Amino acid sequence: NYPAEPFRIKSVETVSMIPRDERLKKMQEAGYNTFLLNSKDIYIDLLTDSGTNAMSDKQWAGMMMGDEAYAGSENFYHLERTVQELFGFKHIVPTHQGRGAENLLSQLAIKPGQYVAGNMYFTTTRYHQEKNGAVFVDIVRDEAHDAGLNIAFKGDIDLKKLQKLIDEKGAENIAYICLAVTVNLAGGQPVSMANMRAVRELTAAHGIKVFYDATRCVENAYFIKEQEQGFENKSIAEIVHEMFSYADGCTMSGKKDCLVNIGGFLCMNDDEMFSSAKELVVVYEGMPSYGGLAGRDMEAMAIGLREAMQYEYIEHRVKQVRYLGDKLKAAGVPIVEPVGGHAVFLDARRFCEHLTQDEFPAQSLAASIYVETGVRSMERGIISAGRNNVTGEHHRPKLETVRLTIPRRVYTYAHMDVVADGIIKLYQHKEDIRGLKFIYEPKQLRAFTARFDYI
Amino acid sequence: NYPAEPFRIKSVETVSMIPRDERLKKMQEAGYNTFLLNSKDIYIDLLTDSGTNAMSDKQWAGMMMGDEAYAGSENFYHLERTVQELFGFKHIVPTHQGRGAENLLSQLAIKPGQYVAGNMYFTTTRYHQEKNGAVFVDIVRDEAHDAGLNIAFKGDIDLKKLQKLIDEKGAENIAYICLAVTVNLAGGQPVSMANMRAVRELTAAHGIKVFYDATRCVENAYFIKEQEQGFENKSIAEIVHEMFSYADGCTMSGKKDCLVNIGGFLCMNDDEMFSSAKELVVVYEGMPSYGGLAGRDMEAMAIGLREAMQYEYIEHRVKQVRYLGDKLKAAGVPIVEPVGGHAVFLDARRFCEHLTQDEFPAQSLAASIYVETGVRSMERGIISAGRNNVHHRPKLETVRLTIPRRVYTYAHMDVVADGIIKLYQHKEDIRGLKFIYEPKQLRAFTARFDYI
Amino acid sequence: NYPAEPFRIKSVETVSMIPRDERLKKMQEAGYNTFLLNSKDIYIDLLTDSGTNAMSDKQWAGMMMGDEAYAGSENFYHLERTVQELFGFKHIVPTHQGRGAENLLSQLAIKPGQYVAGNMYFTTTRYHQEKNGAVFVDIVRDEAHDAGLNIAFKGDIDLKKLQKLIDEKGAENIAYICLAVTVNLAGGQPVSMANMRAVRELTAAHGIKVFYDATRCVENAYFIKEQEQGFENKSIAEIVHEMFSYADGCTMSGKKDCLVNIGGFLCMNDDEMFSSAKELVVVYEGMPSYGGLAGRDMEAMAIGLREAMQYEYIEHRVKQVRYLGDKLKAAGVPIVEPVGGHAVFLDARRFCEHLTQDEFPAQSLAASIYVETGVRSMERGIISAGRNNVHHRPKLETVRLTIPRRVYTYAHMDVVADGIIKLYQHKEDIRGLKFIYEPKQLRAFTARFDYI
Amino acid sequence: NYPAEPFRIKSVETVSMIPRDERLKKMQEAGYNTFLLNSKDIYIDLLTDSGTNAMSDKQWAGMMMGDEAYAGSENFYHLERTVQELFGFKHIVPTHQGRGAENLLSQLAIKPGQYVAGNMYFTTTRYHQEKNGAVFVDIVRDEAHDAGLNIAFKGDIDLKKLQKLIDEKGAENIAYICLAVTVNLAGGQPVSMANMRAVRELTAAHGIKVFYDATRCVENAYFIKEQEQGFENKSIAEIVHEMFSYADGCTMSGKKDCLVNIGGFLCMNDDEMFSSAKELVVVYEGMPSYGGLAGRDMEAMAIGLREAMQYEYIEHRVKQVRYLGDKLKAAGVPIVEPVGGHAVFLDARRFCEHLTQDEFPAQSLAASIYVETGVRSMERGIISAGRNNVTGEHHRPKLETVRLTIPRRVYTYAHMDVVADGIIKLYQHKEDIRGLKFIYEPKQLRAFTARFDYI
Ligand SMILES: CC1=C(O)/C(=C\N=C(/Cc2ccc(O)c(F)c2)C(=O)O)C(COP(=O)(O)O)=CN1
Ligand SMILES: CC1=C(O)/C(=C\N=C(/Cc2ccc(O)c(F)c2)C(=O)O)C(COP(=O)(O)O)=CN1
Ligand SMILES: CC1=C(O)/C(=C\N=C(/Cc2ccc(O)c(F)c2)C(=O)O)C(COP(=O)(O)O)=CN1
Ligand SMILES: CC1=C(O)/C(=C\N=C(/Cc2ccc(O)c(F)c2)C(=O)O)C(COP(=O)(O)O)=CN1
Ligand SMILES: [K+]
Ligand SMILES: [K+]
Numbered sequence A, D: 001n002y003p004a005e006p007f008r009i010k011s012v013e014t015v016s017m018i019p020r021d022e023r024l025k026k027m028q029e030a031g032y033n034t035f036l037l038n039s040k041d042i043y044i045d046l047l048t049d050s051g052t053n054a055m056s057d058k059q060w061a062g063m064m065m066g067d068e069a070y071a072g073s074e075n076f077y078h079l080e081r082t083v084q085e086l087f088g089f090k091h092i093v094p095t096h097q098g099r100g101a102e103n104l105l106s107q108l109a110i111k112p113g114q115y116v117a118g119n120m121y122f123t124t125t126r127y128h129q130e131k132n133g134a135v136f137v138d139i140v141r142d143e144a145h146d147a148g149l150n151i152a153f154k155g156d157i158d159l160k161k162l163q164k165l166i167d168e169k170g171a172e173n174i175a176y177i178c179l180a181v182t183v184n185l186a187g188g189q190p191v192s193m194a195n196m197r198a199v200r201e202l203t204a205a206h207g208i209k210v211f212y213d214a215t216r217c218v219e220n221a222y223f224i225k226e227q228e229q230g231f232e233n234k235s236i237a238e239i240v241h242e243m244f245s246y247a248d249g250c251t252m253s254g255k256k257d258c259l260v261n262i263g264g265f266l267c268m269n270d271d272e273m274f275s276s277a278k279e280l281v282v283v284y285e286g287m288p289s290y291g292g293l294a295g296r297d298m299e300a301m302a303i304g305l306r307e308a309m310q311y312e313y314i315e316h317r318v319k320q321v322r323y324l325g326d327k328l329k330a331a332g333v334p335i336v337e338p339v340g341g342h343a344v345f346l347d348a349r350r351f352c353e354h355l356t357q358d359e360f361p362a363q364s365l366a367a368s369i370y371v372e373t374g375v376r377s378m379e380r381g382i383i384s385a386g387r388n389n390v391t392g393e394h395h396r397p398k399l400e401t402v403r404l405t406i407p408r409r410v411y412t413y414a415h416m417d418v419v420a421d422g423i424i425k426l427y428q429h430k431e432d433i434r435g436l437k438f439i440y441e442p443k444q445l446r447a448f449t450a451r452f453d454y455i
Numbered sequence B, C: 001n002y003p004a005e006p007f008r009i010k011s012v013e014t015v016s017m018i019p020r021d022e023r024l025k026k027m028q029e030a031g032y033n034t035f036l037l038n039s040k041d042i043y044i045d046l047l048t049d050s051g052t053n054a055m056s057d058k059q060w061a062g063m064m065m066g067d068e069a070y071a072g073s074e075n076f077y078h079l080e081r082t083v084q085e086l087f088g089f090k091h092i093v094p095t096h097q098g099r100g101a102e103n104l105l106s107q108l109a110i111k112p113g114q115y116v117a118g119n120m121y122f123t124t125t126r127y128h129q130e131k132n133g134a135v136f137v138d139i140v141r142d143e144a145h146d147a148g149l150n151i152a153f154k155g156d157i158d159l160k161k162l163q164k165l166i167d168e169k170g171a172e173n174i175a176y177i178c179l180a181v182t183v184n185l186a187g188g189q190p191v192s193m194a195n196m197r198a199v200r201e202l203t204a205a206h207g208i209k210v211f212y213d214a215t216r217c218v219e220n221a222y223f224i225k226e227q228e229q230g231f232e233n234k235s236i237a238e239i240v241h242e243m244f245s246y247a248d249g250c251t252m253s254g255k256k257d258c259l260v261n262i263g264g265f266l267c268m269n270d271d272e273m274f275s276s277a278k279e280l281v282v283v284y285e286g287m288p289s290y291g292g293l294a295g296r297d298m299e300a301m302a303i304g305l306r307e308a309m310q311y312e313y314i315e316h317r318v319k320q321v322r323y324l325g326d327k328l329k330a331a332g333v334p335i336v337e338p339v340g341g342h343a344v345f346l347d348a349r350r351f352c353e354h355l356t357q358d359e360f361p362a363q364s365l366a367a368s369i370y371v372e373t374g375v376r377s378m379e380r381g382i383i384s385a386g387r388n389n390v391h392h393r394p395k396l397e398t399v400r401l402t403i404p405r406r407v408y409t410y411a412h413m414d415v416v417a418d419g420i421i422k423l424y425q426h427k428e429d430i431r432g433l434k435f436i437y438e439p440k441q442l443r444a445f446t447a448r449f450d451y452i
């Protein structure tokens, strides 16, 4: 079932164990917005798995060996050869994080008016595509839009949608296919190796490029080894290397599956695009030999990427998240299924049936979760959806969820029990959860700074 | 039930997940002596809680602020002021670890021929006492020698035994009383504040000194807050400060309850003895301003001692050990009771009743534990007792599962428990061992065995 | 004369002492382009002072206290409060380095077609201005373009040039004034407080904004305390705080005067622009609570900015650079004068007068410097200028010896000086180079050359 | 002449630049005893080269890889194989520092009544020898007792003194020969390889053991490569390995030439003595696999010992000390000659001719040095000599010196100029230096806690 941590604790991080009454005052000061809580006032911070990972002793040893030179740093050569060895790509350009690499790729591979198609989208990835004159097309399988359907590899590309897009618009008007592993918007759902092979075969026949969003590719590789027939004898590294053999490049956020707190990079095989990438990286990030990263951070990301290939680490990572999802599902708590690689999504629509969506149930549930447990979670519903600015009304998503995002190697099963036991107790008196109303609302991105109050 | 860790993991330590077949080869290469296993071949190392603790980010920040000066280091001033504030003693002398402080105290407070009495003994403490011409006398309560008797504060000194020693030998022939908190040999058993208060009252009436072995005094302070009536409203620091108010000094191994990997110190209130301590520390340890420790380590120990005062930390520390003991007891595994603050002791006498004591049951059980789970434990039976005469047979024949602080999780405890529980269901298959290396002095450290 | 380092060495960095014959092979392998040399093959790396600084023990202690949370990190609150205290600005937005802040400001304060005027330009700053539809206008004093003229505060804006721009184009067509302290392209030349005060008076009368390039503002503050009458009794922090009182905001590269290896930020007083900055930072850098930086790096930058305010540190920093410039000038080596705060610029035009500009004298001099001494320097002549049309010929043809902060000693400066002085005594032997790789965009970074 | 530092500064240590008037108040608070000054009030601390060294980035990387296990630590195996490789000894026992190893050796190789002979003595080494029932015999060459005689290898053993001791007392009554490299009491003077060969040849013919005090053996090895004919082509490691080939064991203080802040070890080739050494180390230091050291510190000492073998490091170390001595000698400042490997000794007798020794000129000179420059130095004269307690009078040494001890890789030539320029200015008005009188004097070891005042 659930394996113990395949590591020992080397060093601990001090936290404040403030009681419920103080936590309530902190939440009121934050305007009932978990995004406005201070880190020092949080016991278990499940806001995101991005850049919040715990590094290893080996990584911290590399942090002491930072070659901080502006050009020719040994740390960059270590990072370069590691990615070339594990991912198999020809050229590497480091960036300070994932959206820095997406900014580069979108300016290099998109002519204004072309289409970009992928298995759903991410906010920063789709922004840089649309800012550079592209029109996004969702070609994910229809099953990915059913929150309750428990099936494997929900993130697979629908080959029928891809075939019709090529026929309706033409291969010349398609910039590239953006295949994300895993699919964050669908709940961290993986993509099968068979799907990546079929996508590569169909795109190569029309000369269409394929670039991966490899942000959580290691979690995706474990799902292949666990659930895809024929990969039970292959190591995590062998699966990762085959995944990228069906891609012409990738954007990577090291802050996720590279087990670091900062860092990313951009990969490609084309020499001419790599030449243009080195010219553009100096504008936004830095030299091609550090790309907005300190030398010690390139070293940490190179070591972390190699550590992520260990089967026992990634098995425990995914199964720790699954443990939280299983404990909630066994108690009757409504969650999004299947459980993804990095987070558990509570269905706040069913959790707070007594509240309309205009009362922000996911935002109110997140506030109650913190006060009752000291756990910070992220609202992923109507507040994060924003406002259509042409009309001013709320964007209303089908998913009204609270995201419990698990950083890597930071928490234990006992911490997961604290999260579960508190949510389960809340669910047993879920009728007492009250709604919220705006008291402060910003112009753009309201999820980060809006303030509320009980109705 | 059992609280979650009152901290987050900041950094992790890489371990080798070698399978059982590899572990079997490793144990054979080590000659079935867990003391001879390589650290790199161990998943969960429960050999000792001494110096194996995980430090905090605050402590590691202090590690970057090491003032390595030979005299007048700010790190020493931080350590001195911390101990004076929390322990209440007047003078502090740092030592590289606990037995360095015992060497100093034993040469300063023992006249040849005098008696030293305490609630049981420890190997290093008793050696320096006997090396300096003292005869040890155990004045612990008799119940502390019964592994299965579940009573509170097993480490208390028997006041009747202390009164008889004063009458039979005279107060002039008693060097001092050595009160250890907790009592490691009895299984990490605590001493009540009433016992410390009663001991202070009896010794002061005869002019007899009292020095504490404060190695695990914070674990002792939690047991007082949990189980002694009247201390439920008092903080850990208040209890620690009151504990040492009944002592004339103490020896401390920071490698335990100070949450560090090296370090100790010696405390006292007497000015004249403190003067002699500073003259003797330069012979063995170093200057009184660092005492065999780097500046960064004095800083780490000062910060760790203050972190140990946090109620949530020390509550979780003790209850993680109790979780392992409860899970084993619920399956029928014979252990020493009650569970101490730092370790769970398997009763190898009852675990291997089908084996004679000359068959090294505790040593064979520890070897079997590693092969089955990759967990290293310490033999604490006849092998550790040794042979003065041509075997010493102690009443306690145990295997110690010693838990380092802030290093392992409940899931790691489940690995230990589930493997031992499976081993106990086939305890008839655990065979004895045979001597292969002469027991030169401390045989527990270097002896080799075999049976196949 | 020249003060000793106002600090001790805490830790050292290993270097490779390869002989001249090895360096000659390394330079040939690099194609005589210093930008292509490996760090491991360099003794003294004077390529840039950006991100190459040595941090303090205090900063490394903060590196252990990284609060890596996505929002509400204590490290961000420390950085924000530090900048608000020392710079006096109302709002802070962290960025991963300086050009990240310039990308934000250029999209927020530039309407397409407007003019941006400043005391010369920098490559990354001018790109983001021109990419956002601005036309750059240099309003620095004419003396700043003369490498040999030794006058104080060469970076001052010519108020007459600024007045003519306002009259010829109109204040409505001027986006803002970009005042850099110091002026990197002129050789690290400072700007006087009187000039900043006079600029603020003229721009405010027409409603024109003023934004600083504060990358080396601490070096600029020292020159004011040293050479501007009336500031001899004022501390570095007081001067820095007054400098920014004449600005509406600033872009800062922490990799320079904040004594860190990564990091920057964007400051402003206007609430509405700060709201737009937080919406745009999530697109390129990250959340406004970390802005593309790890928590430990925000903490390191906050501590480094406060360390930069120490008079003894910044005095030694500038005077170590001046020591290198004085030793070269005393031997007759042609340099840019006066010596700036962060680098010494060899005048390759005068150093290699026997060589034409199309022969790449600055590039060939930098290659010869490495082979003779193992010192890497940066070409800052026609190669860095590039070719828009089918070569750009700048008035300054220099080789930059850029000094990282707290990394090297006076003895390292003697190695640089003694080797260049020996090279200058045989400057007739320095030969030209020939293009081998097409100058695709920024040719200074990847072009290769040869002559034998 | 003097080479630049063969390294870059990776990190700096903050110091307080307090002015002269404040420094005077600090010195008065310290009772004019530099031993009582606070570290935070000192610019350049030349009190000792013991444990004050700056570590490298490689060492600090090892500090992140500490295997803190009680037995079988990988760090101990690294340290063990390093010493066996570089020193050539068969068995290694770590100790927390040098005097911990001397405590072990003195209890293992000395029967009560035997003699111990060596090239002068050190305080802690001679104490453990005499505490275990030995009688010390100085067999150094007579030239070592002339402070002004500038000759090479002053620390050599006088073979005539050794031959007469064997004849007058018998080989059975000689515990061992304690050969120290370098000789700290003579001013850091080295021992020639020819002397070590002759000592080994003479002792081996009588079955007498030889144990080295290798505390500063790397500095000693450089002097051999620089000044002993025939070793110009041999590396530092080759010279070190040959030095210990003439010894049966050694005591080592890693706090010196191992480039660490704590640590030591004990070496020997005899299996039976090593067996007894492991039994005795558990009493005083700890297990034979850590010996009173954290795992990270065994790793740092192993890395530092290997770093010390680099010719450029040790050449700069010795020549930085020589630079300070040369600048003082060129200005006419009286110093002890020749300059040793680790310190420059000012001749306070000639520096303060207007003061009698009962006025503590070396102590008063050290106080003036700090007030004028912010440099702490050590008194090495009548105060450190102590009091013959049978009579109560002062011990009066021939040497009345102030020791300027240089930690490794901590200071620059510009720091040496601060020391020199301040002492040179003091020497130009040396008649203004006043004497001191006891106001507080302890029973034993007065150099550490005594307080004074101007006469
Ligand atoms: C599948 C994919 C991502 O998941 C992703 C990031 N994810 C994080 C951070 C995040 C992003 C945007 C928000 O509004 C947000 F509140 C949190 C998250 O929490 O989900 C990026 C971007 O990579 P950078 O973050 O290294 O630039 C690219 N691709
Ligand atoms: C109550 C007390 C201790 O428990 C103790 C040590 N504890 C050890 C380490 C150990 C000691 C001796 C052994 O034969 C042994 F096999 C294990 C242990 O595992 O329990 C010391 C000594 O403190 P030092 O270790 O800091 O010097 C003093 N007092
Ligand atoms: C006055 C100013 C700078 O000097 C500066 C950078 N300085 C560099 C690095 C550099 C930059 C561009 C090059 O083509 C180059 F070859 C070297 C340098 O060496 O001088 C930046 C940008 O700050 P970022 O580097 O933190 O983004 C803004 N303003
Ligand atoms: C030739 C030799 C040494 O020089 C030596 C130490 N020397 C230091 C420290 C010191 C020693 C005694 C003092 O009263 C003193 F004030 C300073 C010094 O400053 O000279 C040791 C001892 O090695 P530990 O210091 O690692 O135990 C053994 N052998
Ligand atoms: K850097
Ligand atoms: K030290």
Ligand SMILES: [K+]
Pocket (backbone or CB within 6 Å): A050, A051, A052, A261, A262, C067, C068, C069, C070, C293, C294, C295
């Ligand atoms: K982070």
Ligand SMILES: [K+]
Pocket (backbone or CB within 6 Å): B050, B051, B052, B261, B262, D067, D068, D069, D070, D293, D294, D295
């Ligand atoms: K340890």
